[PDB]
Amino acid sequence: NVFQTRAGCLIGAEHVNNSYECDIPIGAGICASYQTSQSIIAYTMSLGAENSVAYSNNSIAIPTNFTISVTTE
Amino acid sequence: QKLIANQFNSAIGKIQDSLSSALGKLQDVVNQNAQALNTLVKQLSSNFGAISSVLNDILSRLDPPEAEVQIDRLITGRLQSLQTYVTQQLIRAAEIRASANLAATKMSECVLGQSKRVDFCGKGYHLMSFPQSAPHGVVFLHVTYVPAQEKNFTTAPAICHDGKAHFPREGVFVSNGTHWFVTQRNFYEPQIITTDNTFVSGNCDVVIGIVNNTVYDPLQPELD
Amino acid sequence: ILPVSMTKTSVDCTMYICGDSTECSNLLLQYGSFCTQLNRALTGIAVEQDKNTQEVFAQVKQIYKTPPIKDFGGFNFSQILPDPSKPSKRSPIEDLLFNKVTAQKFNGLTVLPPLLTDEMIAQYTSALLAGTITSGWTFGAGPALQIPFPMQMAYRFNGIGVTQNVLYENQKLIANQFNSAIGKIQDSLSSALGKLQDVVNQNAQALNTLVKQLSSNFGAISSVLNDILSRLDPPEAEVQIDRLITGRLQSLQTYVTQQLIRAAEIRASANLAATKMSECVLGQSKRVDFCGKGYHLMSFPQSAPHGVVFLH
Amino acid sequence: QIITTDNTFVSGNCDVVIGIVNNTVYDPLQPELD
Numbered sequence: 001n002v003f004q005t006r007a008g009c010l011i012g013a014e015h016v017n018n019s020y021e022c023d024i025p026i027g028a029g030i031c032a033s034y035q036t037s038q039s040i041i042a043y044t045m046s047l048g049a050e051n052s053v054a055y056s057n058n059s060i061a062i063p064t065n066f067t068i069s070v071t072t073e
Numbered sequence: 074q075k076l077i078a079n080q081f082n083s084a085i086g087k088i089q090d091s092l093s094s095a096l097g098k099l100q101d102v103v104n105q106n107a108q109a110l111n112t113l114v115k116q117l118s119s120n121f122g123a124i125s126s127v128l129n130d131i132l133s134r135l136d137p138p139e140a141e142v143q144i145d146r147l148i149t150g151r152l153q154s155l156q157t158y159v160t161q162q163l164i165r166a167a168e169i170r171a172s173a174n175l176a177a178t179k180m181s182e183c184v185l186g187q188s189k190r191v192d193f194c195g196k197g198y199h200l201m202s203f204p205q206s207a208p209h210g211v212v213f214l215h216v217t218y219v220p221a222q223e224k225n226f227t228t229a230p231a232i233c234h235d236g237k238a239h240f241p242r243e244g245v246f247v248s249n250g251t252h253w254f255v256t257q258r259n260f261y262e263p264q265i266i267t268t269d270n271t272f273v274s275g276n277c278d279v280v281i282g283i284v285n286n287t288v289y290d291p292l293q294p295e296l297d
Numbered sequence: 298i299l300p301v302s303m304t305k306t307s308v309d310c311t312m313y314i315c316g317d318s319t320e321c322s323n324l325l326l327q328y329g330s331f332c333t334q335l336n337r338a339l340t341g342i343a344v345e346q347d348k349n350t351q352e353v354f355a356q357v358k359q360i361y362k363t364p365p366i367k368d369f370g371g372f373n374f375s376q377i378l379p380d381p382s383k384p385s386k387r388s389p390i391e392d393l394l395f396n397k398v399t400a401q402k403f404n405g406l407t408v409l410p411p412l413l414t415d416e417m418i419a420q421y422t423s424a425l426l427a428g429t430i431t432s433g434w435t436f437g438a439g440p441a442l443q444i445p446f447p448m449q450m451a452y453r454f455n456g457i458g459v460t461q462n463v464l465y466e467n468q469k470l471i472a473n474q475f476n477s478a479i480g481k482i483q484d485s486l487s488s489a490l491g492k493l494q495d496v497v498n499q500n501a502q503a504l505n506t507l508v509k510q511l512s513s514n515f516g517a518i519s520s521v522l523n524d525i526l527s528r529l530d531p532p533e534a535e536v537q538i539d540r541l542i543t544g545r546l547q548s549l550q551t552y553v554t555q556q557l558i559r560a561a562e563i564r565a566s567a568n569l570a571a572t573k574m575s576e577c578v579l580g581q582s583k584r585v586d587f588c589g590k591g592y593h594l595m596s597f598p599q600s601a602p603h604g605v606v607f608l609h
Numbered sequence: 610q611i612i613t614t615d616n617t618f619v620s621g622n623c624d625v626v627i628g629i630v631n632n633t634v635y636d637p638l639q640p641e642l643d
């Protein structure tokens with residue numbers, strides 16, 4: 001119902017501890033989205049895919065295939 | 074070659090389908106220009122502190138000696154509005170000039186050649202760009218080269234064959250568990266370590282990491 | 298030192314030009330288009346400042362974590378990588394820069410908080426550092442790979458015309474020189490910031506001038522708009538009120554133009570810093586004297602308040 | 610220049626490119642071993 005964040009007071013949307021991607025920005029590292037009925041939820045934006053690259057002093061990765069991608073600017 | 078041609082055709086079709094589903098950079102400047110134009114037309118509907126908005130009404134109901142202060146007030150209000158519009162247009166024109174300089178550099182480098190700078194002509198290794206006509210702008214079809222599938226390998230920075238360290242000229246020493254091969258850093262092309270692709274530089278007692286490998290020495294079999 | 302963002306602010310007319318009087322709002326309707334222009338310009342400036350952080354730090358959509366193995370062939374990364382002793386994610390160097398560089402919301406000149414916090418900027422810099430020391434350039438140009446740092450440094454040596462046989466023969470010397478250079482720049486950075494302190498001082502000076510202009514009569518008989526209303530009568534003091542509004546409007550337009558010029562300069566600096574990151578950080582730029590004086594090998598970005606630094 | 614081994618590298622088989630021609634290589638180490 002009523003949520004208090006760093007960027008003021010936010011009403012009309014609940015707060016969820018889960019972190020997803022940021023669609024509609026709000027401020028101070030918190031965004032809102034219309035997810036699952038369904039309602040607007042305010043949450044901390046995810047910074048990306050949390051993955052760890054296996055690094056070793058005798059380990060290398062050589063690609064074996066490729067995709068020809070075209071990007072429109 | 075057929076696989077790369079099919080991938081390029083599929084990418085062209087994919088961006089054609091995606092672009093048919095609006096534009097952000099091109100539609101922004103048109104919207105700003107339209108908003109500025111609309112504000113310029115709507116400015117004359119105000120009074121700027123005077124008793125009338127149109128000069129005809131005040132000039133009709135009051136004599137020009139009485140309308141002198143109101144006409145001067147309207148003059149300075151419209152002058153301030155025109156100065157603000159000119160300043161905004163100058164800032165927007167500077168932004169468009171910077172964007173056009175960036176696009177000209179992009180056309181000079183990525184379109185008229187292969188730019189060696191990364192992350193300038195699309196994400197990944199740039200190959201070529203195809204410019205297309207756009208209203209009040211230009212777009213570039215940055216044909217890039219990115220890896221898709223990779224494998225884990227065991228690497229050694231040098232090879233000591235007969236007391237001398239061997240280093241790859243362009244490739245890198247990789248292993249799949251039992252044998253050792255050399256391949257480029259952008260594709261997996263395992264090759265037998267030979268004299269042609271390896272050069273001797275000093276001994277093998279100066280590098281922290283090394284493996285006990287051998288050299289095929291292709292000169293030797295053809296000597297018999 | 299290259300600044301990438303400045304202080305975001307939002308200034309309205311009813312709170313700055315007007316006070317607690319109703320006739321000010323009635324006379325402000327004839328200049329409502331100007332206030333709409335100024336509000337739209339300030340909103341666009343805030344949006345531009347929010348976008349500038351994304352183009353510089355958010356170059357990778359995947360977060361890379363530093364492996365627990367700190368054996369990088371002799372290269373000491375303690376100062377650039379975050380430490381687990383401090384709860385904050387700032388690197389030792391970042392912590393030094395945070396304290397190195399140093400209300401105005403009284404009259405409605407509120408400050409909009411940035412979309413990306415300093416912790417998130419530090420996390421972005423740490424992810425970029427982890428990607429650089431484990432893949433070099435493949436994490437910024439496609440799928441992320443793995444490579445030892447000795448081989449990555451040999452690869453960086455090959456990009457300037459020097460073969461790789463001069464690296465492994467004196468790898469200890471190169472590692473010691475790199476550690477000594479990192480210690481030297483750490484010691485020299487503790488002695489202030491030129492580019493970063495200029496924009497903050499300029500914004501503070503602009504805000505101070507904005508609140509100081511309210512104490513000027515602008516040719517009228519009073520400075521505040523309440524004294525004329527309390528002492529004089531409305532219809533004869535309307536000229537003094539209108540003079541106050543047009544003076545405050547001229548001051549606000551001058552402030553808006555100055556902030557727009559400063560925002561254009563900030564956008565140019567942010568584009569320059571983003572290009573520097575994309576070329577020198579996410580790879581090896583072949584342009585001479587672009588990533589430093591000499592032959593460039595690699596760069597380590599570090600988080601800074603309202604800016605970013607590069608350790609080429 | 611005369612097409613030799615030094616400036617040409619071998620990779621793959623022959624029936625992989627749609628456009629190929631028949632030619633000879635001087636093999637600059639063959640006369641030296643005589």
Ligand SMILES: *[C@@H]1O[C@H](CO)[C@@H](O[C@@H]2O[C@H](CO)[C@@H](O)[C@H](O)[C@H]2NC(C)=O)[C@H](O)[C@H]1NC(C)=O
Pocket residue numbers: 064065066076079080083221222
């Ligand atoms: C590299 O990737 C391409 C594209 O995914 C692969 O091409 C596909 O190959 C499969 C089986 O050979 C076919 O069923 C698909 O139709 C192909 N797709 C396209 C677009 O041509 C290719 O096989 C991959 N190469 C390797 C060595 O894995």
Ligand SMILES: *[C@@H]1O[C@H](CO)[C@@H](O[C@@H]2O[C@H](CO)[C@@H](O)[C@H](O)[C@H]2NC(C)=O)[C@H](O)[C@H]1NC(C)=O
Pocket residue numbers: 249250251252
């Ligand atoms: C690693 O790659 C090498 C090169 O292909 C493999 O060695 C060959 O293996 C095949 C059968 O697996 C043999 O017929 C060849 O004679 C081998 N080559 C040589 C030079 O001996 C090797 O098997 C691969 N390792 C693994 C674990 O698959």
Ligand SMILES: *[C@@H]1O[C@H](CO)[C@@H](O[C@@H]2O[C@H](CO)[C@@H](O)[C@H](O)[C@H]2NC(C)=O)[C@H](O)[C@H]1NC(C)=O
Pocket residue numbers: 283284285
């Ligand atoms: C690679 O092979 C060489 C020669 O077989 C090894 O060098 C010998 O190492 C043993 C013990 O490590 C010494 O007792 C010998 O005196 C060395 N001989 C020479 C000629 O140097 C070398 O150790 C091998 N590499 C590894 C990693 O085991």
Ligand SMILES: *[C@@H]1O[C@H](CO)[C@@H](O[C@@H]2O[C@H](CO)[C@@H](O)[C@H](O)[C@H]2NC(C)=O)[C@H](O)[C@H]1NC(C)=O
Pocket residue numbers: 373374375376
């Ligand atoms: C990397 O550099 C740091 C310097 O910041 C080293 O940390 C120092 O280690 C010495 C040795 O005991 C201590 O006396 C200092 O107090 C440490 N300084 C700090 C700030 O912690 C660290 O040891 C170096 N690591 C390597 C592997 O060389």
Ligand SMILES: *[C@@H]1O[C@H](CO)[C@@H](O[C@@H]2O[C@H](CO)[C@@H](O)[C@H](O)[C@H]2NC(C)=O)[C@H](O)[C@H]1NC(C)=O
Pocket residue numbers: 630631
């Ligand atoms: C290039 O040389 C190859 C082999 O020397 C030729 O291939 C032969 O073609 C004839 C007639 O087309 C066949 O009878 C043989 O069986 C083929 N041999 C092989 C090994 O494929 C090829 O025709 C030559 N190309 C040209 C243009 O003359």
Ligand SMILES: *[C@@H]1O[C@H](CO)[C@@H](O)[C@H](O)[C@H]1NC(C)=O
Pocket residue numbers: 054223224225
């Ligand atoms: C390489 O190994 C790491 C962990 O050992 C794993 O996460 C990664 O998926 C492996 N790479 C491939 C291509 O399988």
Ligand SMILES: *[C@@H]1O[C@H](CO)[C@@H](O)[C@H](O)[C@H]1NC(C)=O
Pocket residue numbers: 057058281282283368
């Ligand atoms: C890699 O590092 C580990 C940990 O110190 C060490 O045991 C191993 O010998 C190293 N390998 C090489 C090839 O240097």
Ligand SMILES: *[C@@H]1O[C@H](CO)[C@@H](O)[C@H](O)[C@H]1NC(C)=O
Pocket residue numbers: 627628629
């Ligand atoms: C070139 O294209 C023509 C037109 O189809 C074709 O007849 C010819 O065989 C082609 N040559 C090569 C070498 O591909």
